[PDB]
Amino acid sequence: RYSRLQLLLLFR
Amino acid sequence: ANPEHYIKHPLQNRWALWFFKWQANLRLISKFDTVEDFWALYNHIQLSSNLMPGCDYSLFKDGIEPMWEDEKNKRGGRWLITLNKQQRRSDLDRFWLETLLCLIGESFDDYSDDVCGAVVNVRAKGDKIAIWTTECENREAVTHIGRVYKERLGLPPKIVIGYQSHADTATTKNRFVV
Ligand SMILES: [Cl-]
């Protein structure tokens, strides 16, 4: 569903 | 456009964070099933490196208890990373976060269904991190999870990690190696 990049991108 | 109502990004599975300080000492901290709720939880809690000796964190799929005797754990085992005492500063927090990301990100392709959860042991003798899988005889799943996990953590090419069944830990020889 999510790549590693996407998980980190969603840390706000 | 920044919306008035921001919609979070749902994870493939709902996850539960546990804390250990035997079955009396277990405590469920929080559950989450979005990426943003994961980060809110991670941001707020203490780092593994800051915990007292003999404490654990565990992250497991919703409905699986972080113990050998659970139905999803009974027949299973763990890929074990052992840290030396010096590595608590350099590697512990870094390895634990990356382990959490492997779990919530479903990073093991088809074989992420075999993953039950993960545990970090904070100890004076040396810290330990492990990914727990559901079936020690699922050789293809255990093998794939191990290789990817080891390479995601960035562990030296020289060193080897081992997979122990929970059965052999309860009575420990390695059932697999990568
Ligand atoms: Cl890393």
Author numbering:
A (entry chain D): 1 to 12
B (entry chain A): 29 to 49, 56 to 205, 211 to 217
Provide the authors' original text about this structure.
The eukaryotic translation initiation factor 4E (eIF4E) protein is a vital component of the cap-dependent mechanism for mRNA translation. It binds the 7-methylguanosine (m7G) cap structure present at the 5′ end of mRNA molecules and recruits it as part of the eIF4F assembly which also includes two other partner proteins, eIF4A and eIF4G, to the translational machinery for protein synthesis.
Phenylalanine and glutamine residues characterize distinct chemical properties which are complimentary to the targeted patch on eIF4E. It is interesting to observe that sTIP-14 and sTIP-15 respectively showed a 2-fold and a 7-fold improvement (KD of 195 nM and 54 nM respectively) in binding eIF4E; the latter is clearly comparable to other good binders reported in this study. The 2-fold improvement in the KD of sTIP-14 over sTIP-12 is primarily due to a 2-fold reduction in its rate of dissociation (koff: 0.058 s–1 and 0.14 s–1 respectively). The phenylalanine residue (F11) of the added “11FR12” sequence efficiently interacts with the patch on eIF4E by forming pi-stacking interactions with aromatic residues W73, Y76 and hydrophobic interactions with L131. The last arginine (R12) is exposed to the solvent and does not appear to form any specific interactions with the protein in the crystal structure.
